[PDB]
Amino acid sequence: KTLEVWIMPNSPQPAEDFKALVAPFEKAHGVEVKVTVLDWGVAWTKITTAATSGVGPDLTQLGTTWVGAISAMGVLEPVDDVLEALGGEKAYLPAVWRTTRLEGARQATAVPWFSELRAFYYRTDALKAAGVNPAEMFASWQGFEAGLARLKASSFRDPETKAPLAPLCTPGRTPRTLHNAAPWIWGAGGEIVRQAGGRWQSALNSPESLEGLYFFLSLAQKGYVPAESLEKNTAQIEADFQAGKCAVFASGPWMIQRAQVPEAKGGFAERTAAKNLGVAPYPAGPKGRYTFFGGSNLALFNFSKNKPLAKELLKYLGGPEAQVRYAQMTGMLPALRSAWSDPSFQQNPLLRTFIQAAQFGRTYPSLAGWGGVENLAVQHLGMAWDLVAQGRLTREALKDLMDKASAAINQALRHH
Template sequence: MKTSSFKPSYLASTLLLATTLGMASQSAMATELNIWIMSTTTQQQQDMKELLRPYLAKNPNLRVNVTVLNWESAWSKITAAAASGQGPDLLELGTTWVAAISSMGALEPLSAQQQNEVGGAKAFFPAVWGSTHRYDDTKIYALPWYADARAAFYRTDVFKKAGINPKDAFTNWGSFKQAMQKINGQMVDGKKIAALGYPGKNDWNVVHNLAPWIWNAGGDLLTADKKHSAINSPEALQAITYYTSFAAEGLVPSSALEKDSSQIESGFFNGQYAVIFTGSWILRQLNTPKAKGGQMDSVAAHNFGVESYPAGLKGNQTFFSGSDLAIMKSSKNKDEAWKLLSFMTSREAEVNYSKMSGMLPARQDAANDPTLMADPHYAEFIAQVKNGRHYPSVAGWGPLESVYLKNIGNMFDIVAGVKGKYTPQAIKQALDVTANEANDVLDESR
């Protein structure tokens, strides 16, 4: 079940690995903690070793066994552990997973004192703090570790050549469409560049890609009472029709609809698209030399800027999620697990992990750390994503997102002209089917 909030392309190939970190005492007095982590870097084991090194140096009698899961199988492994009580002491959960796992009674609630020790709700971005508990439960079951937010990345040289001020272009939906129409097909380095690149049904981010447009039209993924799907509301239909119109009008190449997010990002790097909407992790790629697998030597790396989503009638919010850390109720070492959890969500640790992974710190003081803000593009990104929003924190979000992912993905067959003629009515019919299936899932989860 693919319900995680963040899945860069290399995660799917990560193998289940385990290693022992720390200068552990061989005596019987040593405490052993098991932690499950998903891979957000290309060398997760080594990076975890470096991240935990200062903590383990101060706790020589602590042994930490780190198991790296891939996102594709993590959901089934974690739910199995939750059901059996045979899981780790500490585990990473995608922000959309916390409500479901806590509803299974598998997570240890964090006391008010513990929350205060790490700064409480005010220390973290509000959007990700909302993921630490169910919307109908005031108990906190996790702490935010890192954040995933989205913004527009655009080619400054292409906009300049077209005589377009980016600030004007990203003002609202109307100005954005006009800018894309003007840019589309411009010759750059001897080849035509497409105005916009976004993936279609072969991408795991389909729901994430649509959410900001729906929110900015005044819609949502669920009704206000969290009991029914709102994917076919007039506001959602307006947003999705607007979004898909870029592909229908040729402003997004038909070939892009066959790609995933990673391939769209590569297309931005090599000059296929003037604008894409994606996360902070590509900043790290744009700052990394080609010899180390990065894109620092590309034309895009020297000619890009960051802007917010163009505003709809109800604002310009962005998708804001990430991963949390939680203690399992079955842990026999809850005190030690808490100490490790508080270290991993400290300002220092979150800054260091951001540098390793390219993800945003979930702590606001860490996100605004001078060493990170020294990168002007990172500072631009932070300025654009503070108005972030997360999905409703409901227990049934996992299976619900799978329904959305499947059906909205299939909707792109209509957009691509593979399945019938593209019309607003055809899109509405597809969304009605999606909402009916989603409501069945929501009924089962209550």
């Protein structure tokens, strides 16, 4: 009677890392845990097929934004008991607690596993050369844009590339998520959706959502993001920062680990970027400072024949030791807030800065139809990036694109 867990590729050797993570559990319970790794490309279909058919694992990883949809299909075992065992609501950042259930539900259907959050990496050497104070640049929108202007004008050249750096790298081609836009929307006082007028509705066409989205998108149109960045994807921009092409770029905590180890093990300790690496939280907008939170949770299918032992494994994976260990393996932040005290975070100044950024964490409402909302939002955000690529984004053009986004989202939110 052996547990079956489904995971996605969260670490360099996903199945073996997971098996090393649960070795102490296996010993204590006299059990083997079986793991299957699902590519992110097919994980959603595999998990919805398990949901509809009843053919699946005991435990599955879920992206945080998936919890509403799978919970609303009726297939997840309540895990309030597990979360209470881990410390209950105060054991988590509120944005992370929000991901434990369908929005508005009283019963928890998912256990927080690990957190993606995003902050700005910068080249300490580039900002020093351009006369930019990092505290000022990453404090506010005005500091941020003034910084990028100084970096655009800087005579500084990367030691290894012998070329100027792009002030900001951000991808403009084929956006799959709102995660790079959301902090700007939120900082302006906006949101992606809201409860207004008795309904969930798009808030992308609100003046405040448009202010934040225009502020961000216009940086690229002012020459702070080179056309070559605009043209690209998400591991390219990490490769670009590593390769000394970008002064500033947003990423998660995994780049810190990578900066600390040589090319041998898949790091960039050798590159000028590793030796001149800073991190700062997103700047405050006019209506607040917000950090995007994502990541993954664990869930138990209620058709499992080993729910008792599966709940023990959720307690283990969700708990302090496994939280610290799996954060190291994945390069993510623990979902269990107590684990942030661990020396592995507190002895690394760049990881302490991520924990500073964590205090401002926010995430999307846990809606059953969240995926439809985000798919329509990203499609229209990509239309906006396309106007940037032509230098044709105006405030009126962005407003028109988000009014079309909002009609489509509102229609999708009226259907289940």
